Design brief:
- It comes from Thermus thermophilus (strain ATCC 27634 / DSM 579 / HB8).
- Its main location: cytoplasm.
- It is found in: Cytoplasm; Cell inner membrane.
- Monomer. Binds to the 30S ribosomal subunit, between the head and platform, contacting the 16S rRNA. Contacts ribosomal proteins S7 and S18 and may contact proteins S2 and S11.
- Pfam families: KH_2, MMR_HSR1.
- The chain is α/β, with parallel strands linked by helices.
- It folds into two domains: 182 residues, 3-Layer(aba) Sandwich (Rossmann fold); 114 residues, GMP Synthetase, Chain A, domain 3 (2-Layer Sandwich).
- The protein contains ten helices and nine strands.
- The protein has a six-stranded mixed sheet, sandwiched between helices. A three-stranded mixed sheet has the order 7-8-9.
- Strand 5, helix 4 and strand 6 form a beta-alpha-beta unit.
- Helix 6 crosses helix 9.
- The protein is globular, with a radius of gyration of 20 Å.
- The two termini are 39 Å apart.
- Bound molecules: phosphoaminophosphonic acid-guanylate ester and magnesium ion.
């Protein structure tokens, strides 16, 4: 009879496991993940429907001090993610004590204390040496939050968190139909993000942060083969050379890894063509940002 529905923002500094947590809460990979401290750049909605209850999760960019136009967009994305939700999941890395970036998040959540439930989720319990001490320090930054320690990779602990969040949703009609996709994004966007993820993990120094991607063509082909053409943009000529690599070895590595992940997630054959292009300092180009989808 009755139905419950709400939004849950997932926030925290970069690299704590926010996107990993979302994918595991949903049971399907919808968000890019990488070991680099600036992977997510735009809010991403993950739709969880369980029985008569629905949660629209909002993954967000890691909170940080903006350095350029892209950073400003990202900062605005976090701010807007926190404007109207029914609960907030603040993810922290239990492997170390709070950093100034974590304190930045605690500060951003103060106005929500007492207004919306805040769950302080300590992540990476599996790799933390001093989980308890770390968790205690994080909690002192926002005493009002409900603390818990887990690994976003642990099925049982994540399922427990999911149950606790569903019980917090207010009565109301579902925001999305119960048969809606697991995330609110186009197939093209999802593919471009998978490619960016594989690129970021295989590039170093400043290059990962200069990478943007876009799918320009998707089409049925060959013998049940899905054809995909995508562009990997960089900000400068020296980066293009490095992404391509000696004899095109680097871009081939990236392309192969992306094709294989795509085939494993889609369960079908994929033929992927990649082209590397320079989009002149696009992170500072308002027009470029709009073309690339970082619009607002
Ligand atoms: N050992 C361990 N690693 C984890 C866990 N959860 C996430 N990670 C790792 O932490 C890194 C960052 O995870 P990710 O989900 O991209 O973090 P994020 O908070 O979304 N980063 P950003 O804000 O930049 O988008 C990845 O290498 C990921 O595999 C966990 O429970 N245990
Ligand atoms: Mg992320």
């Amino acid at each position: 009879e009755k139905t419950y529905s709400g939004f849950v923002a997932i926030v925290g500094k970069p690299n704590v496991g926010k996107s990993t947590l979302l994918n595991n809460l949903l049971g399907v990979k919808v968000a890019p993940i990488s070991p680099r401290p600036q992977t997510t750049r735009k809010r991403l909605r993950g739709i969880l429907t369980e029985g008569r209850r629905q949660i629209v999760f909002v993954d967000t960019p890691g909170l940080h001090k903006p350095m350029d136009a892209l950073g400003e967009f990202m900062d605005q994305e976090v701010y807007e993610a926190l404007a109207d939700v029914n609960a907030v999941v603040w993810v922290v890395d239990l492997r170390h004590p709070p950093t100034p970036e974590d304190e930045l998040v605690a500060r951003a959540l103060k106005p929500l204390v007492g207004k919306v439930p805040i769950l302080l989720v300590g992540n990476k319990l599996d790799a933390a040496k001093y989980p308890e001490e770390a968790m205690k320090a994080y909690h002192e930054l926002l005493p009002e939050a409900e603390p818990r320690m887990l690994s976003a990779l642990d099925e049982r602990q994540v399922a427990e968190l999911k149950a606790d969040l569903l019980a917090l949703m207010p009565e109301g009609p579902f925001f999305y139909p119960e048969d809606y996709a697991k995330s609110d994004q186009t197939f093209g966007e999802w593919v471009a993000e998978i490619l960016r993820e594989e690129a970021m993990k295989r590039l170093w120094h400043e290059v990962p942060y200069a990478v943007a991607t876009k799918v320009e063509e998707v089409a049925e082909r060959e013998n049940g083969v899905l054809y995909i053409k995508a562009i990997l943009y960089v900000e400068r000529p020296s980066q293009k050379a490095i992404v391509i690599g000696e004899g095109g070895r680097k871009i081939k590595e990236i392309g192969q890894a992306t094709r294989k992940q795509l085939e494993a997630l889609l369960g079908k054959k994929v033929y992927l063509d990649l082209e590397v292009k320079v989009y002149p300092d696009w992170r500072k180009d308002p027009e470029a940002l709009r073309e690339l989808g970082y619009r607002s």
